[PDB]
Amino acid sequence: HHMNSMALKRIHKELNDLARDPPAQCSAGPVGDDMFHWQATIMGPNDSPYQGGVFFLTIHFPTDYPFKPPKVAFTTRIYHPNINSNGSICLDILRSQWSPALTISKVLLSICSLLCDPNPDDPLVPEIARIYQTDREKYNRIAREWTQKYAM
């Protein structure tokens, strides 16, 4: 017979790799004994208006990982064009551009990259995209305000 544990082995591998080479601002791991449900924490990137913030996420790996992406959501509020009040993240690799070559460390690094470099032309929060496009000084000030309001 078969053992059906290859997703679990992949997730374990990815967890061990994460400990040895952490994406710098980030921690992540299983909530308790369930390897398919993780929590994560992202410290606001230093050259970003989220500096000083601590943002919590949930990660749910599918049973057929790595052949489908993990489902990742923010649980902390953030002022960003691509992350909505439900914590949903608009990031290509979590949708059409997922590859089984990717890993949770790559996903966390890409979220951090998104925090630094929003994609305002593919928004989940259209006002925040508008402010980003038209008045970056205002965007950074409000993003700092919200970091202090919700993420510190």
mmCIF file of all heavy atoms in Angstrom, residues 48-50 55 74 77-85 88-90 110-120 122-129 132 139 142-143 146:
data_model
loop_
_atom_site.group_PDB
_atom_site.id
_atom_site.type_symbol
_atom_site.label_atom_id
_atom_site.label_comp_id
_atom_site.label_asym_id
_atom_site.label_seq_id
_atom_site.Cartn_x
_atom_site.Cartn_y
_atom_site.Cartn_z
ATOM 1 N N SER A 48 10.148 50.775 5.024
ATOM 2 C CA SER A 48 8.761 50.722 4.631
ATOM 3 C C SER A 48 8.031 51.479 5.671
ATOM 4 O O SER A 48 8.536 51.669 6.789
ATOM 5 C CB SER A 48 8.258 49.299 4.497
ATOM 6 O OG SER A 48 7.769 48.703 5.709
ATOM 7 N N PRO A 49 6.812 51.963 5.312
ATOM 8 C CA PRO A 49 6.093 52.687 6.320
ATOM 9 C C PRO A 49 5.519 51.803 7.448
ATOM 10 O O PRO A 49 4.919 52.338 8.410
ATOM 11 C CB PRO A 49 5.002 53.387 5.501
ATOM 12 C CG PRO A 49 4.711 52.458 4.372
ATOM 13 C CD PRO A 49 6.028 51.750 4.073
ATOM 14 N N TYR A 50 5.780 50.479 7.344
ATOM 15 C CA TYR A 50 5.296 49.520 8.330
ATOM 16 C C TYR A 50 6.385 49.196 9.348
ATOM 17 O O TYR A 50 6.153 48.401 10.217
ATOM 18 C CB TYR A 50 4.911 48.224 7.638
ATOM 19 C CG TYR A 50 3.985 48.472 6.467
ATOM 20 C CD1 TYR A 50 4.455 48.277 5.157
ATOM 21 C CD2 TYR A 50 2.680 48.961 6.654
ATOM 22 C CE1 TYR A 50 3.624 48.505 4.021
ATOM 23 C CE2 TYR A 50 1.818 49.285 5.532
ATOM 24 C CZ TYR A 50 2.329 49.016 4.225
ATOM 25 O OH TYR A 50 1.552 49.267 3.178
ATOM 26 N N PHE A 55 2.961 42.056 12.307
ATOM 27 C CA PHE A 55 1.743 41.642 11.568
ATOM 28 C C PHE A 55 1.592 40.126 11.685
ATOM 29 O O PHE A 55 2.568 39.333 11.439
ATOM 30 C CB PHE A 55 1.874 42.061 10.066
ATOM 31 C CG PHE A 55 1.998 43.511 9.875
ATOM 32 C CD1 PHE A 55 3.231 44.136 9.966
ATOM 33 C CD2 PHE A 55 0.841 44.276 9.740
ATOM 34 C CE1 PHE A 55 3.315 45.559 9.872
ATOM 35 C CE2 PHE A 55 0.904 45.726 9.683
ATOM 36 C CZ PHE A 55 2.147 46.330 9.749
ATOM 37 N N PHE A 74 -3.712 37.766 6.210
ATOM 38 C CA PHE A 74 -3.360 38.607 7.378
ATOM 39 C C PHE A 74 -4.444 38.584 8.424
ATOM 40 O O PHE A 74 -5.686 38.507 8.113
ATOM 41 C CB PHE A 74 -3.196 40.066 6.968
ATOM 42 C CG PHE A 74 -1.786 40.472 6.578
ATOM 43 C CD1 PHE A 74 -1.267 39.945 5.413
ATOM 44 C CD2 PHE A 74 -1.015 41.435 7.293
ATOM 45 C CE1 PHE A 74 0.020 40.217 4.975
ATOM 46 C CE2 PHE A 74 0.322 41.756 6.814
ATOM 47 C CZ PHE A 74 0.826 41.092 5.672
ATOM 48 N N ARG A 77 -4.730 44.237 10.795
ATOM 49 C CA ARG A 77 -5.079 45.295 9.810
ATOM 50 C C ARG A 77 -3.822 46.034 9.328
ATOM 51 O O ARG A 77 -2.862 46.247 10.102
ATOM 52 C CB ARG A 77 -6.001 46.327 10.448
ATOM 53 C CG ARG A 77 -7.332 45.722 10.910
ATOM 54 C CD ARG A 77 -8.163 45.103 9.790
ATOM 55 N NE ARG A 77 -8.490 46.046 8.712
ATOM 56 C CZ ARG A 77 -9.381 47.045 8.784
ATOM 57 N NH1 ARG A 77 -10.073 47.290 9.902
ATOM 58 N NH2 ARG A 77 -9.571 47.814 7.712
ATOM 59 N N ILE A 78 -3.852 46.400 8.069
ATOM 60 C CA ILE A 78 -2.740 47.062 7.336
ATOM 61 C C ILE A 78 -3.294 47.955 6.245
ATOM 62 O O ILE A 78 -4.258 47.581 5.549
ATOM 63 C CB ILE A 78 -1.703 45.995 6.787
ATOM 64 C CG1 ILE A 78 -0.457 46.682 6.282
ATOM 65 C CG2 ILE A 78 -2.433 45.110 5.729
ATOM 66 C CD1 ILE A 78 0.738 45.722 5.984
ATOM 67 N N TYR A 79 -2.626 49.095 6.057
ATOM 68 C CA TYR A 79 -2.926 50.007 4.979
ATOM 69 C C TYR A 79 -2.033 49.709 3.771
ATOM 70 O O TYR A 79 -0.911 50.118 3.720
ATOM 71 C CB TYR A 79 -2.626 51.417 5.466
ATOM 72 C CG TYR A 79 -3.197 52.545 4.557
ATOM 73 C CD1 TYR A 79 -4.557 52.912 4.624
ATOM 74 C CD2 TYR A 79 -2.349 53.270 3.697
ATOM 75 C CE1 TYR A 79 -5.042 53.965 3.875
ATOM 76 C CE2 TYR A 79 -2.826 54.351 2.958
ATOM 77 C CZ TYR A 79 -4.200 54.664 3.010
ATOM 78 O OH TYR A 79 -4.699 55.682 2.261
ATOM 79 N N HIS A 80 -2.584 48.952 2.801
ATOM 80 C CA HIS A 80 -1.805 48.478 1.668
ATOM 81 C C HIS A 80 -2.785 48.202 0.514
ATOM 82 O O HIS A 80 -3.839 47.617 0.740
ATOM 83 C CB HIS A 80 -1.085 47.155 2.038
ATOM 84 C CG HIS A 80 -0.060 46.711 1.031
ATOM 85 N ND1 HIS A 80 -0.395 46.065 -0.158
ATOM 86 C CD2 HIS A 80 1.292 46.735 1.085
ATOM 87 C CE1 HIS A 80 0.710 45.811 -0.832
ATOM 88 N NE2 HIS A 80 1.747 46.211 -0.100
ATOM 89 N N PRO A 81 -2.396 48.522 -0.741
ATOM 90 C CA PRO A 81 -3.332 48.357 -1.876
ATOM 91 C C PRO A 81 -3.750 46.916 -2.141
ATOM 92 O O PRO A 81 -4.798 46.732 -2.730
ATOM 93 C CB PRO A 81 -2.508 48.876 -3.092
ATOM 94 C CG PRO A 81 -1.451 49.715 -2.502
ATOM 95 C CD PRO A 81 -1.154 49.234 -1.133
ATOM 96 N N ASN A 82 -2.927 45.966 -1.717
ATOM 97 C CA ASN A 82 -3.122 44.553 -2.141
ATOM 98 C C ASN A 82 -3.575 43.662 -1.033
ATOM 99 O O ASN A 82 -3.544 42.418 -1.222
ATOM 100 C CB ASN A 82 -1.802 43.991 -2.742
ATOM 101 C CG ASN A 82 -1.311 44.849 -3.956
ATOM 102 O OD1 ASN A 82 -0.305 45.556 -3.863
ATOM 103 N ND2 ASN A 82 -2.127 44.891 -5.003
ATOM 104 N N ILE A 83 -3.914 44.218 0.121
ATOM 105 C CA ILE A 83 -4.359 43.414 1.290
ATOM 106 C C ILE A 83 -5.595 44.042 1.880
ATOM 107 O O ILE A 83 -5.609 45.272 2.181
ATOM 108 C CB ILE A 83 -3.224 43.376 2.412
ATOM 109 C CG1 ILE A 83 -1.918 42.900 1.858
ATOM 110 C CG2 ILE A 83 -3.704 42.558 3.588
ATOM 111 C CD1 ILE A 83 -0.681 43.173 2.752
ATOM 112 N N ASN A 84 -6.697 43.267 1.983
ATOM 113 C CA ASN A 84 -7.989 43.917 2.276
ATOM 114 C C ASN A 84 -8.341 43.659 3.728
ATOM 115 O O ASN A 84 -7.512 43.088 4.463
ATOM 116 C CB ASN A 84 -9.104 43.473 1.305
ATOM 117 C CG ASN A 84 -9.548 42.083 1.513
ATOM 118 O OD1 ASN A 84 -9.167 41.398 2.468
ATOM 119 N ND2 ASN A 84 -10.326 41.596 0.565
ATOM 120 N N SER A 85 -9.488 44.184 4.150
ATOM 121 C CA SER A 85 -9.810 44.142 5.575
ATOM 122 C C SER A 85 -10.143 42.748 6.057
ATOM 123 O O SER A 85 -10.173 42.584 7.286
ATOM 124 C CB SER A 85 -10.993 45.096 5.837
ATOM 125 O OG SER A 85 -12.171 44.546 5.255
ATOM 126 N N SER A 88 -7.138 39.218 3.046
ATOM 127 C CA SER A 88 -6.830 38.584 1.777
ATOM 128 C C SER A 88 -5.696 39.263 1.105
ATOM 129 O O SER A 88 -5.632 40.524 1.142
ATOM 130 C CB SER A 88 -8.049 38.618 0.824
ATOM 131 O OG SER A 88 -9.152 37.935 1.424
ATOM 132 N N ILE A 89 -4.820 38.478 0.492
ATOM 133 C CA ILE A 89 -3.620 39.009 -0.125
ATOM 134 C C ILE A 89 -3.671 38.788 -1.610
ATOM 135 O O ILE A 89 -3.692 37.622 -2.072
ATOM 136 C CB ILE A 89 -2.342 38.316 0.418
ATOM 137 C CG1 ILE A 89 -2.220 38.404 1.971
ATOM 138 C CG2 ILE A 89 -1.104 38.941 -0.298
ATOM 139 C CD1 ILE A 89 -1.140 37.548 2.573
ATOM 140 N N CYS A 90 -3.596 39.874 -2.376
ATOM 141 C CA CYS A 90 -3.544 39.788 -3.839
ATOM 142 C C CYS A 90 -2.047 39.667 -4.258
ATOM 143 O O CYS A 90 -1.311 40.653 -4.295
ATOM 144 C CB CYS A 90 -4.250 40.978 -4.513
ATOM 145 S SG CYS A 90 -4.221 40.773 -6.335
ATOM 146 N N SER A 110 8.113 36.883 -0.665
ATOM 147 C CA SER A 110 7.304 37.653 -1.646
ATOM 148 C C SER A 110 6.303 38.579 -0.960
ATOM 149 O O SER A 110 6.070 39.679 -1.457
ATOM 150 C CB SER A 110 6.578 36.753 -2.651
ATOM 151 O OG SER A 110 7.442 35.852 -3.363
ATOM 152 N N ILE A 111 5.717 38.150 0.146
ATOM 153 C CA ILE A 111 4.836 39.068 0.918
ATOM 154 C C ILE A 111 5.615 40.251 1.410
ATOM 155 O O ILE A 111 5.137 41.410 1.318
ATOM 156 C CB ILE A 111 4.118 38.331 2.048
ATOM 157 C CG1 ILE A 111 3.226 37.271 1.372
ATOM 158 C CG2 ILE A 111 3.387 39.346 2.957
ATOM 159 C CD1 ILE A 111 2.646 36.195 2.354
ATOM 160 N N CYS A 112 6.806 40.007 1.966
ATOM 161 C CA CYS A 112 7.635 41.138 2.375
ATOM 162 C C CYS A 112 7.964 42.073 1.221
ATOM 163 O O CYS A 112 7.881 43.284 1.398
ATOM 164 C CB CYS A 112 8.938 40.742 3.057
ATOM 165 S SG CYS A 112 8.582 39.919 4.643
ATOM 166 N N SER A 113 8.257 41.525 0.047
ATOM 167 C CA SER A 113 8.557 42.326 -1.144
ATOM 168 C C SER A 113 7.309 43.162 -1.482
ATOM 169 O O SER A 113 7.420 44.331 -1.845
ATOM 170 C CB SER A 113 8.916 41.405 -2.291
ATOM 171 O OG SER A 113 10.249 40.911 -2.123
ATOM 172 N N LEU A 114 6.126 42.547 -1.368
ATOM 173 C CA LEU A 114 4.871 43.255 -1.668
ATOM 174 C C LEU A 114 4.674 44.424 -0.725
ATOM 175 O O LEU A 114 4.243 45.496 -1.160
ATOM 176 C CB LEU A 114 3.707 42.234 -1.647
ATOM 177 C CG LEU A 114 2.312 42.736 -2.034
ATOM 178 C CD1 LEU A 114 2.149 43.127 -3.488
ATOM 179 C CD2 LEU A 114 1.308 41.671 -1.598
ATOM 180 N N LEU A 115 5.003 44.241 0.539
ATOM 181 C CA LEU A 115 4.898 45.332 1.540
ATOM 182 C C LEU A 115 5.749 46.524 1.149
ATOM 183 O O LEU A 115 5.352 47.693 1.322
ATOM 184 C CB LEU A 115 5.260 44.848 2.941
ATOM 185 C CG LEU A 115 4.318 43.786 3.525
ATOM 186 C CD1 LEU A 115 4.709 43.635 4.989
ATOM 187 C CD2 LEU A 115 2.831 44.179 3.394
ATOM 188 N N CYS A 116 6.941 46.233 0.640
ATOM 189 C CA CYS A 116 7.830 47.296 0.168
ATOM 190 C C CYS A 116 7.464 47.915 -1.153
ATOM 191 O O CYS A 116 7.677 49.110 -1.309
ATOM 192 C CB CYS A 116 9.274 46.810 0.066
ATOM 193 S SG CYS A 116 9.890 46.248 1.591
ATOM 194 N N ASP A 117 6.967 47.084 -2.074
ATOM 195 C CA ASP A 117 6.632 47.433 -3.506
ATOM 196 C C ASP A 117 5.213 46.941 -3.830
ATOM 197 O O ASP A 117 5.030 45.900 -4.482
ATOM 198 C CB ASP A 117 7.465 46.699 -4.608
ATOM 199 C CG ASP A 117 8.967 46.887 -4.546
ATOM 200 O OD1 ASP A 117 9.518 47.654 -3.755
ATOM 201 O OD2 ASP A 117 9.623 46.182 -5.363
ATOM 202 N N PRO A 118 4.198 47.697 -3.421
ATOM 203 C CA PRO A 118 2.825 47.377 -3.791
ATOM 204 C C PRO A 118 2.603 47.302 -5.323
ATOM 205 O O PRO A 118 3.371 47.907 -6.103
ATOM 206 C CB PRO A 118 2.029 48.564 -3.209
ATOM 207 C CG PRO A 118 2.846 48.998 -2.080
ATOM 208 C CD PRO A 118 4.256 48.877 -2.540
ATOM 209 N N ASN A 119 1.543 46.604 -5.717
ATOM 210 C CA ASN A 119 1.054 46.512 -7.079
ATOM 211 C C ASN A 119 -0.282 47.273 -7.190
ATOM 212 O O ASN A 119 -1.354 46.667 -7.235
ATOM 213 C CB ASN A 119 0.921 45.027 -7.471
ATOM 214 C CG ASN A 119 2.261 44.313 -7.437
ATOM 215 O OD1 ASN A 119 2.445 43.173 -6.871
ATOM 216 N ND2 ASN A 119 3.234 44.955 -8.081
ATOM 217 N N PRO A 120 -0.239 48.618 -7.243
ATOM 218 C CA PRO A 120 -1.521 49.342 -7.192
ATOM 219 C C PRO A 120 -2.458 49.142 -8.420
ATOM 220 O O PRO A 120 -3.668 49.485 -8.362
ATOM 221 C CB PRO A 120 -1.076 50.787 -7.083
ATOM 222 C CG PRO A 120 0.252 50.804 -7.883
ATOM 223 C CD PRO A 120 0.910 49.508 -7.467
ATOM 224 N N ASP A 122 -3.350 46.246 -9.512
ATOM 225 C CA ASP A 122 -4.179 45.061 -9.252
ATOM 226 C C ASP A 122 -4.663 45.124 -7.786
ATOM 227 O O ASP A 122 -4.256 44.277 -6.952
ATOM 228 C CB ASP A 122 -3.459 43.733 -9.617
ATOM 229 C CG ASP A 122 -4.420 42.521 -9.661
ATOM 230 O OD1 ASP A 122 -5.668 42.710 -9.516
ATOM 231 O OD2 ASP A 122 -3.944 41.352 -9.844
ATOM 232 N N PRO A 123 -5.549 46.106 -7.469
ATOM 233 C CA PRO A 123 -5.860 46.306 -6.042
ATOM 234 C C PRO A 123 -6.955 45.454 -5.474
ATOM 235 O O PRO A 123 -7.901 45.015 -6.199
ATOM 236 C CB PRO A 123 -6.362 47.756 -6.003
ATOM 237 C CG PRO A 123 -6.741 48.134 -7.317
ATOM 238 C CD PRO A 123 -6.267 47.090 -8.314
ATOM 239 N N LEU A 124 -6.865 45.248 -4.180
ATOM 240 C CA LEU A 124 -7.975 44.760 -3.435
ATOM 241 C C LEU A 124 -8.590 45.966 -2.725
ATOM 242 O O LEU A 124 -9.747 45.833 -2.345
ATOM 243 C CB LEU A 124 -7.596 43.713 -2.383
ATOM 244 C CG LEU A 124 -7.065 42.440 -2.905
ATOM 245 C CD1 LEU A 124 -6.875 41.472 -1.800
ATOM 246 C CD2 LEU A 124 -8.051 41.964 -4.010
ATOM 247 N N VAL A 125 -7.813 47.057 -2.483
ATOM 248 C CA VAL A 125 -8.366 48.224 -1.775
ATOM 249 C C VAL A 125 -8.192 49.462 -2.648
ATOM 250 O O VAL A 125 -7.115 50.064 -2.684
ATOM 251 C CB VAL A 125 -7.695 48.466 -0.344
ATOM 252 C CG1 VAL A 125 -8.570 49.452 0.444
ATOM 253 C CG2 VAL A 125 -7.597 47.091 0.379
ATOM 254 N N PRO A 126 -9.212 49.767 -3.433
ATOM 255 C CA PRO A 126 -8.982 50.738 -4.496
ATOM 256 C C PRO A 126 -8.598 52.121 -3.980
ATOM 257 O O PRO A 126 -7.804 52.809 -4.675
ATOM 258 C CB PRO A 126 -10.328 50.845 -5.231
ATOM 259 C CG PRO A 126 -11.255 49.999 -4.568
ATOM 260 C CD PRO A 126 -10.574 49.235 -3.394
ATOM 261 N N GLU A 127 -9.132 52.572 -2.836
ATOM 262 C CA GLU A 127 -8.700 53.932 -2.373
ATOM 263 C C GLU A 127 -7.217 53.991 -2.055
ATOM 264 O O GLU A 127 -6.559 54.978 -2.283
ATOM 265 C CB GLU A 127 -9.511 54.380 -1.156
ATOM 266 C CG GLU A 127 -9.096 55.724 -0.620
ATOM 267 C CD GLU A 127 -9.194 56.834 -1.644
ATOM 268 O OE1 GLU A 127 -9.944 56.740 -2.642
ATOM 269 O OE2 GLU A 127 -8.629 57.946 -1.375
ATOM 270 N N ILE A 128 -6.715 52.923 -1.449
ATOM 271 C CA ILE A 128 -5.326 52.880 -0.997
ATOM 272 C C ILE A 128 -4.427 52.819 -2.242
ATOM 273 O O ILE A 128 -3.401 53.563 -2.279
ATOM 274 C CB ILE A 128 -5.105 51.696 -0.125
ATOM 275 C CG1 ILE A 128 -6.044 51.779 1.075
ATOM 276 C CG2 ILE A 128 -3.569 51.677 0.285
ATOM 277 C CD1 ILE A 128 -5.815 50.752 2.160
ATOM 278 N N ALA A 129 -4.886 52.061 -3.276
ATOM 279 C CA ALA A 129 -4.161 52.128 -4.568
ATOM 280 C C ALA A 129 -4.096 53.520 -5.158
ATOM 281 O O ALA A 129 -3.062 53.931 -5.678
ATOM 282 C CB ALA A 129 -4.731 51.099 -5.594
ATOM 283 N N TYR A 132 -1.659 55.634 -3.186
ATOM 284 C CA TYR A 132 -0.298 55.191 -3.537
ATOM 285 C C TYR A 132 0.183 55.788 -4.857
ATOM 286 O O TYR A 132 1.350 56.270 -4.952
ATOM 287 C CB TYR A 132 -0.274 53.653 -3.609
ATOM 288 C CG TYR A 132 1.116 53.109 -3.880
ATOM 289 C CD1 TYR A 132 2.030 52.964 -2.826
ATOM 290 C CD2 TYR A 132 1.508 52.769 -5.191
ATOM 291 C CE1 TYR A 132 3.345 52.480 -3.054
ATOM 292 C CE2 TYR A 132 2.790 52.263 -5.417
ATOM 293 C CZ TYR A 132 3.719 52.175 -4.358
ATOM 294 O OH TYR A 132 5.003 51.655 -4.603
ATOM 295 N N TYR A 139 0.413 58.446 1.227
ATOM 296 C CA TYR A 139 0.336 56.995 1.453
ATOM 297 C C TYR A 139 1.281 56.595 2.614
ATOM 298 O O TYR A 139 0.882 55.803 3.539
ATOM 299 C CB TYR A 139 0.742 56.275 0.189
ATOM 300 C CG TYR A 139 0.952 54.796 0.363
ATOM 301 C CD1 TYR A 139 -0.164 53.999 0.279
ATOM 302 C CD2 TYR A 139 2.164 54.294 0.669
ATOM 303 C CE1 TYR A 139 -0.091 52.682 0.382
ATOM 304 C CE2 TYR A 139 2.291 52.890 0.854
ATOM 305 C CZ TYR A 139 1.112 52.139 0.692
ATOM 306 O OH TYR A 139 1.066 50.756 0.772
ATOM 307 N N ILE A 142 -0.113 57.763 6.067
ATOM 308 C CA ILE A 142 -1.273 56.970 6.547
ATOM 309 C C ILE A 142 -0.891 55.566 6.865
ATOM 310 O O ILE A 142 -1.391 55.021 7.849
ATOM 311 C CB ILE A 142 -2.450 57.059 5.564
ATOM 312 C CG1 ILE A 142 -2.755 58.538 5.367
ATOM 313 C CG2 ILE A 142 -3.603 56.303 6.070
ATOM 314 C CD1 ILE A 142 -3.799 58.782 4.194
ATOM 315 N N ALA A 143 -0.006 54.957 6.063
ATOM 316 C CA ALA A 143 0.452 53.636 6.391
ATOM 317 C C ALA A 143 1.207 53.604 7.753
ATOM 318 O O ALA A 143 0.984 52.632 8.507
ATOM 319 C CB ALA A 143 1.329 53.081 5.290
ATOM 320 N N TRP A 146 -1.582 53.825 10.439
ATOM 321 C CA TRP A 146 -2.263 52.555 10.659
ATOM 322 C C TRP A 146 -1.363 51.537 11.345
ATOM 323 O O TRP A 146 -1.898 50.652 12.027
ATOM 324 C CB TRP A 146 -2.740 51.990 9.308
ATOM 325 C CG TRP A 146 -4.056 52.557 8.794
ATOM 326 C CD1 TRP A 146 -4.422 53.860 8.683
ATOM 327 C CD2 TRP A 146 -5.135 51.813 8.213
ATOM 328 N NE1 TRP A 146 -5.687 53.991 8.153
ATOM 329 C CE2 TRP A 146 -6.127 52.745 7.816
ATOM 330 C CE3 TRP A 146 -5.353 50.469 8.007
ATOM 331 C CZ2 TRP A 146 -7.315 52.355 7.208
ATOM 332 C CZ3 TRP A 146 -6.558 50.070 7.396
ATOM 333 C CH2 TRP A 146 -7.517 51.019 7.027
#
